[PDB]
Curated annotation (Swiss-Prot), chain A:
Role this protein plays: Component of the ribosome, a large ribonucleoprotein complex responsible for the synthesis of proteins in the cell. The small ribosomal subunit (SSU) binds messenger RNAs (mRNAs) and translates the encoded message by selecting cognate aminoacyl-transfer RNA (tRNA) molecules. The large subunit (LSU) contains the ribosomal catalytic site termed the peptidyl transferase center (PTC), which catalyzes the formation of peptide bonds, thereby polymerizing the amino acids delivered by tRNAs into a polypeptide chain.
Oligomer status and interactors: Component of the large ribosomal subunit (LSU). Mature yeast ribosomes consist of a small (40S) and a large (60S) subunit. The 40S small subunit contains 1 molecule of ribosomal RNA (18S rRNA) and 33 different proteins (encoded by 57 genes). The large 60S subunit contains 3 rRNA molecules (25S, 5.8S and 5S rRNA) and 46 different proteins (encoded by 81 genes). uL3 forms together with ES39L one of the contact sites for the signal recognition particle that targets ribosomes to the endoplasmic reticulum membrane.
Family: Belongs to the universal ribosomal protein uL3 family.
Disulfide pattern: none
Full-sequence range covered: 51 to 98 of 387
Subcellular location: Cytoplasm
Gene inactivation effect: A mutant confers resistance to trichodermin, a trichotecene toxin produced by plant-pathogenic fungi.
Full protein name: Large ribosomal subunit protein uL3
Curated annotation (Swiss-Prot), chain B:
Residues recorded as bearing Phosphothreonine in the entry: 163
Keywords of this entry: Cytoplasm, Isopeptide bond, Nucleus, Phosphoprotein, Ribonucleoprotein, Ribosomal protein, Ribosome biogenesis, rRNA processing, Ubl conjugation
Predominant localisation class: cytoplasm
Complete-protein stretch covered: 1 to 170 of 236
Name of this chain's protein: Small ribosomal subunit protein eS6A
Keyword Ribonucleoprotein among record annotations: yes
Recorded name of the encoding gene: RPS6A
Record text on subunit structure and interactions: Component of the small ribosomal subunit (SSU). Mature yeast ribosomes consist of a small (40S) and a large (60S) subunit. The 40S small subunit contains 1 molecule of ribosomal RNA (18S rRNA) and 33 different proteins (encoded by 57 genes). The large 60S subunit contains 3 rRNA molecules (25S, 5.8S and 5S rRNA) and 46 different proteins (encoded by 81 genes). Interacts with snoRNA U3. uS11 interacts with MPP10. Component of the ribosomal small subunit (SSU) processome composed of at least 40 protein subunits and snoRNA U3.
One of the record's GO molecular function terms: structural constituent of ribosome
Compartments (UniProt record): Cytoplasm; Nucleus, Nucleolus
Originating organism: Saccharomyces cerevisiae (strain ATCC 204508 / S288c) (Baker's yeast)
GO BP of this protein: maturation of SSU-rRNA from tricistronic rRNA transcript (SSU-rRNA, 5.8S rRNA, LSU-rRNA); translation
UniProtKB/Swiss-Prot annotation, chain C:
UniProt key word Transcription regulation: no
Name listed for the protein in its UniProt record: Large ribosomal subunit protein uL14A
Stored CDD domains: Ribosomal_uL14
Gene: RPL23A
Keywords: Acetylation, Cytoplasm, Methylation, Ribonucleoprotein, Ribosomal protein
Modification type N6,N6-dimethyllysine: residues: 105, 109
Location within or outside the cell: Cytoplasm
Family affiliation: Belongs to the universal ribosomal protein uL14 family.
InterPro entries, per the entry: Ribosomal_uL14, Ribosomal_uL14_CS, Ribosomal_uL14_sf
Any single biological process term in GO: cytoplasmic translation
Classification via SMART domains: Ribosomal_L14
Annotated Gene Ontology cellular component terms: cytosol; cytosolic large ribosomal subunit
Biological function: Component of the ribosome, a large ribonucleoprotein complex responsible for the synthesis of proteins in the cell. The small ribosomal subunit (SSU) binds messenger RNAs (mRNAs) and translates the encoded message by selecting cognate aminoacyl-transfer RNA (tRNA) molecules. The large subunit (LSU) contains the ribosomal catalytic site termed the peptidyl transferase center (PTC), which catalyzes the formation of peptide bonds, thereby polymerizing the amino acids delivered by tRNAs into a polypeptide chain.
UniProtKB/Swiss-Prot annotation, chain E:
GO cellular component, one term: cytosol
Family: Belongs to the eukaryotic ribosomal protein eL24 family.
GO biological process, one term: cytoplasmic translation
Protein's UniProt name: Large ribosomal subunit protein eL24A
GO molecular function, one term: structural constituent of ribosome
Main location: cytoplasm
Parent-protein start and end of this portion: 1 to 98 of 155
Subcellular location: Cytoplasm
Native source species: Saccharomyces cerevisiae (strain ATCC 204508 / S288c) (Baker's yeast)
UniProt gene name: RPL24A
Length: 48, 170, 136, 96, 98
RNA sequence: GAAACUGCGAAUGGCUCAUUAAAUCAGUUAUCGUUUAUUUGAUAGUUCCUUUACUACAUGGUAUAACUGUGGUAAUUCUAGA
RNA sequence: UGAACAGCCUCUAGUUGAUAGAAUAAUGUAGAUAAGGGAAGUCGGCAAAAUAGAUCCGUAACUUCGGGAUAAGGAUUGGCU
RNA sequence: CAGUCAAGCGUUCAUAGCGACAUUGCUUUUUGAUUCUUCGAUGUCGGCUCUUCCUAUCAUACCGAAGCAGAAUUCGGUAAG
RNA sequence: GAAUGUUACCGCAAUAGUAAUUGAACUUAGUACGAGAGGAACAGUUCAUUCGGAUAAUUGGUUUUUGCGGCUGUCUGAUCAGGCAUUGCCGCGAAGCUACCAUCCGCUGGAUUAUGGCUGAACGCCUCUAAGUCAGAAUCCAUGCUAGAACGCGGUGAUUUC
RNA sequence: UGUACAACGGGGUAUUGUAAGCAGUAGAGUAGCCUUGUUGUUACGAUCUGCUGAGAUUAAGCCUUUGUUGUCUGAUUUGU
């Protein structure tokens, strides 16, 4: 769908930005439920 | 941050301490003199209305009504002015000062109760403290009792007992 | 970077390639700083080394006290101009490229830095935090 | 309050002011993944479980957002909600 | 997370947004976008640029309800008397006459 | 009689000789060309109001320090709210 | 308009002739812009950028005293009244 | 460019690291020697650009040895990822 | 892209390609070693370099959005609103494209080499080697990733009547 | 022949920076008629102010839609 910005406290003991705010970019994937409609079975063969 | 609450009807005052950023956040961007409905600050202060009167940020600099700005500034202060007592006749000084806009950079808010809620606050509503001194000028006595320029003061002036041990004085 | 820089540095946009000239910001007699190298830079066929805020370069003084001219000396970039971005997400830039002459250990040569300094430089060399007016 | 936080609180979804550009609105569940992803807007994507257990510490870090920008992406958006915009701007020649 | 404001146009500068400029005298100028930032670099005077806060404030535009009355007062009247001088005998002798 | 207010003083004293060459300085003028705390001597019956149903004169107003009490800062002859 | 037979716009007159249609890949030819640095590019600043009119102020070495000189360096410029 | 013998060098100690007098080789980015191919024409140097290959390895991985205390270094192995 | 009945969907995987690199700081630790002067490393953390694949929330660049505004010259009587100056010039400028000038991600198993060893004869002793065997490298084979043989393959859907 | 598709229209989101028109006791000022002004009057004057964050553009690869109008069987070929 798109991208946006996010702010959060970073939890990285030892880093100059431990317990500090960062802004990070994030994508957003639209994700409505998949509907199940079949099962498929696979067998192992010497050709794969 | 630390709230510094004053009950000026009782002369009472006591500091409370508030954690949790959402409870505080009610004061943010509120100016000095803006009233705040209490329940947002707690359930103990339900209904209580607090007028924002001042206070100090970290590093201890005072606020100063009228500046706006949720920042610090450095101003030229004069006699008869806040956050400055001059040392010398007609002396001005350039001193830092914190802005009248509340921020999380504050160590201490200063609040003044205006309307009392539905519940009592301990060291505040429950206790009451006496006005140290009483009237000294003539007409102020006649107006702290209502007497008309007939009643003669002398016996209406206050009288404070204090003891030598076995000699109690007046 | 390197010697006597206690600390790491998060990468920031490279604004000063070699041959750039930046205001000498201390009070030693030097007036500007001409970058001939970057310390700890890497190799790529045809890439100019470049300095960023808090880097340690090698400079020569182009305009300044004669007893300071015509010779190499370390220096620390204290102000950029090429806007970089911090991890709190701000894109910020100074008004001028500037640096202060220092020794390999990272102690300064003069006794003050005139103008502001970036924190990512003052956080990196103590003796710069010593002589820093306003930081960032 | 899809796009609200423990620290944001305000009722608002992830859809930016005037909606995801070249896309739409997001009216269903969604995955918000850090960074950028191969492929472009409207394209079928496959999110796949990892193939190894990463002790990265960088992966492992439990994260909680503070704030999710919901300003319009169609320009240099200045406002999160239409509420917020009206607050700052005032009443206009349309309007009340 | 502080939502700064544009030191030219007076808009909110939500996190990670716009530019920050650190002038010579060490004064910081936060711009929300390139528009204000270029207008700033142009020596343009925000009080002459119609769409800015600083212009609107100065020209008293749309303010209306802030110059409208409110209601924030109280009513006290409680007595304490004087410390060291019996707060009791300060309401009985305080029976007054006119 | 602490503190604090108020008043006066801190513009004298002491130090140096860098600038300064018609400047300073000096001797001699000028203020019919001006300011002057102080000291000393003088100097003030008039203040209200369409002018009988009068205006506190037997004396009109508050707002502050010190102080009490709640506080902030690593830090100053910092000072905030009550 | 402007110093002008310059450039740019117009009246008179005269043209509207030069295969056409659809797209706007790479690479080109011709026209442009680019943060920060600023010749580090290259045999070489090649190419490009910079400068530019006019009114005023200011102008070095050296010289065959004629120059060098728009030396260099500055400021100013609309409209309306 | 690499060996073999080992008189010597290396405080002592031939061979840790070296190595004379001799002697055996390898290589074909040296230069020669030759004149086979092209003189009815195989575009001459360098640079830019870009790929790939060799190893007689400069760095990086893991090792053996030292006249390797540590630190640094030298000799060597597997190694051209 | 013709032809292996037509057409469609979902897949297998032969062969081929393949990828990551290097450094510093903290800490270890002023430690082991040393008369001293000097002076490490393995584990852990934080970053960086060279490389690679993406990506465009942000910031930057680009501007025929000829979008809004502005300016010069002229032409439409003036007004409004416009034409022309090979896109007339200037400020701003969304969308798109795009930058270590921007952000994000860059997998872990086995088998070996050198080398150090185990057991152990040949050779009643001894020997890592002869038989057998352990541990081992930026190597190699996999895992992973990119093609998918247009003459390698499977599963499944529907399959025409005037 | 329908949570259909399209063209417009509406709403959102953007960009610029306040449209035209009208008004004004704003305006350096300037004319013209006297009944020569205890604002004389009628106009004119770059610009300013008000209605006006107005107007204008906004998918051409933005978002959205209970409205309006319209469209919905042409062609070719394929079998174990
Ligand atoms: Mg760090
Ligand atoms: Mg080169
Ligand atoms: Mg920059
Ligand atoms: Mg110091
Ligand atoms: Mg400081
Ligand atoms: Mg759509
Ligand atoms: Mg965008
Ligand atoms: Mg966009
Ligand atoms: Mg832009
Ligand atoms: Mg005094
Ligand atoms: Mg004196
Ligand atoms: Mg008062
Ligand atoms: Mg002409
Ligand atoms: Mg032709
Ligand atoms: Mg054509
Ligand atoms: Mg082209
Ligand atoms: Mg450039
Ligand atoms: Mg530039
Ligand atoms: Mg330059
Ligand atoms: Mg060169
Ligand atoms: Mg040069
Ligand atoms: Mg060259
Ligand atoms: Mg030459
Ligand atoms: Mg050369
Ligand atoms: Mg030549
Ligand atoms: Mg040149
Ligand atoms: Mg050339
Ligand atoms: Mg040229
Ligand atoms: Mg230019
Ligand atoms: Mg010359
Ligand atoms: Mg010039
Ligand atoms: Mg003028
Ligand atoms: Mg011999
Ligand atoms: Mg020996
Ligand atoms: Mg010997
Ligand atoms: Mg030998
Ligand atoms: Mg031999
Ligand atoms: Mg041979
Ligand atoms: Mg040969
Ligand atoms: Mg050779
Ligand atoms: Mg030959
Ligand atoms: Mg031939
Ligand atoms: Mg030929
Ligand atoms: Mg050829
Ligand atoms: Mg030829
Ligand atoms: Mg020995
Ligand atoms: Mg040793
Ligand atoms: Mg050493
Ligand atoms: Mg070995
Ligand atoms: Mg070996
Ligand atoms: Mg290789
Ligand atoms: Mg090979
Ligand atoms: Mg240590
Ligand atoms: Mg030591
Ligand atoms: Mg020793
Ligand atoms: Mg990507
Ligand atoms: Mg442009
Ligand atoms: Mg235009
Ligand atoms: Mg008009
Ligand atoms: Mg024409
Ligand atoms: Mg022409
Ligand atoms: Mg053109
Ligand atoms: Mg212009
Ligand atoms: Mg853009
Ligand atoms: Mg493009
Ligand atoms: Mg980066
Ligand atoms: Mg990259
Ligand atoms: Mg990584
Ligand atoms: Mg992988
Ligand atoms: Mg794996
Ligand atoms: Mg294997
Ligand atoms: Mg074994
Ligand atoms: Mg054994
Ligand atoms: Mg034997
Ligand atoms: Mg073995
Ligand atoms: Mg064996
Ligand atoms: Mg054997
Ligand atoms: Mg590897
Ligand atoms: Mg794969
Ligand atoms: Mg095949
Ligand atoms: Mg084929
Ligand atoms: Mg196939
Ligand atoms: Mg097969
Ligand atoms: Mg098949
Ligand atoms: Mg089949
Ligand atoms: Mg239609
Ligand atoms: Mg208008
Ligand atoms: Mg109208
Ligand atoms: Mg307006
Ligand atoms: Mg296209
Ligand atoms: Mg409608
Ligand atoms: Mg048939």
């Amino acid at each position: 769908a798109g991208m946006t910005t996010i702010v959060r406290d970073l939890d990285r003991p030892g880093s100059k930005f431990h317990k500090r705010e960062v802004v990070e970019a994030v994508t957003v994937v639209d994700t409505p439920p998949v509907v199940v409609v079949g099962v498929v079975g696979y067998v192992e063969t010497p050709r794969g | 941050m630390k709230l510094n609450i004053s009950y000026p009807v009782n002369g009472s005052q006591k500091t409370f301490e508030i954690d949790d950023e959402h409870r505080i956040r009610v004061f943010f961007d509120k100016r000095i003199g803006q009233e705040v409905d209490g329940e947002a600050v707690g359930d103990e202060f339900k209904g209580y209305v607090f007028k924002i009167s001042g206070g100090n940020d970290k590093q201890g600099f005072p606020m100063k009504q009228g500046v706006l700005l949720p920042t610090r500034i450095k101003l030229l202060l004069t006699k008869n002015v806040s956050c400055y007592r001059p040392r010398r006749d007609g002396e001005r000084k350039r001193k830092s000062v914190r802005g009248a806009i509340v921020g999380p950079d504050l160590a201490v808010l200063a609040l003044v109760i205006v309307k009392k809620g539905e519940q009592e606050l301990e060291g505040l509503t429950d206790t009451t403290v006496p006005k140290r001194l009483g009237p000294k000028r003539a007409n102020n006595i006649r107006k702290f009792f209502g007497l008309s320029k007939e009643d003669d003061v002398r016996d209406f002036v206050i009288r404070r007992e204090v003891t030598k041990g076995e000699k109690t004085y007046t | 970077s390197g010697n006597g820089a206690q600390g790491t540095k998060f990468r920031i946009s490279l604004g000063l390639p070699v041959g750039a000239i930046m205001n000498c910001a201390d009070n030693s007699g030097a007036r500007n700083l001409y970058i001939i190298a970057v310390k700890g830079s890497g190799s790529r066929l045809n890439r100019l080394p470049a300095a960023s805020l808090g880097d340690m370069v090698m400079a020569t003084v182009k305009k300044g006290k004669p007893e300071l001219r015509k010779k190499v000396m370390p220096a620390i970039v204290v102000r950029q101009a090429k806007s970089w971005r911090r991890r709190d997400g701000v894109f910020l830039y100074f008004e001028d490229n500037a640096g202060v002459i220092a020794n390999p250990k990272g102690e300064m040569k003069g006794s003050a830095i005139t103008g502001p300094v970036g924190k990512e430089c003052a956080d990196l060399w103590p003796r710069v935090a010593s002589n820093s007016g306003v930081v960032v | 309050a899809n796009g609200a936080t423990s620290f944001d609180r305000t009722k608002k979804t992830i859809t930016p002011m005037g909606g995801f550009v070249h896309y739409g609105e997001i009216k269903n569940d969604f995955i918000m993944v850090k960074g950028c992803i191969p492929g472009n807007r409207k394209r079928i994507v496959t999110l796949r479980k990892s193939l190894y257990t990463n002790t990265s510490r960088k992966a492992l870090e439990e994260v909680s957002l503070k704030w999710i920008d919901t300003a319009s992406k169609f320009g240099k958006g200045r406002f999160q909600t239409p509420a917020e915009k009206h607050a700052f701007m005032g009443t206009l020649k349309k309007d009340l | 997370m502080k939502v700064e404001i544009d030191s030219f146009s007076g808009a909110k500068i939500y996190p990670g947004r716009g530019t920050l400029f650190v002038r010579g005298d060490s004064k910081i100028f936060r711009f929300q976008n390139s528009k204000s930032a270029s207008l700033f670099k142009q020596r343009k005077n925000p009080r002459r640029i119609a769409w800015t806060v600083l212009f609107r404030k100065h020209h008293k535009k749309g303010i209306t309800e802030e110059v409208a009355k409110k209601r924030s007062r109280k009513t006290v009247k409680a007595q304490r008397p004087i410390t060291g001088a019996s707060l009791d005998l300060i309401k009985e002798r305080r029976s007054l006459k006119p």
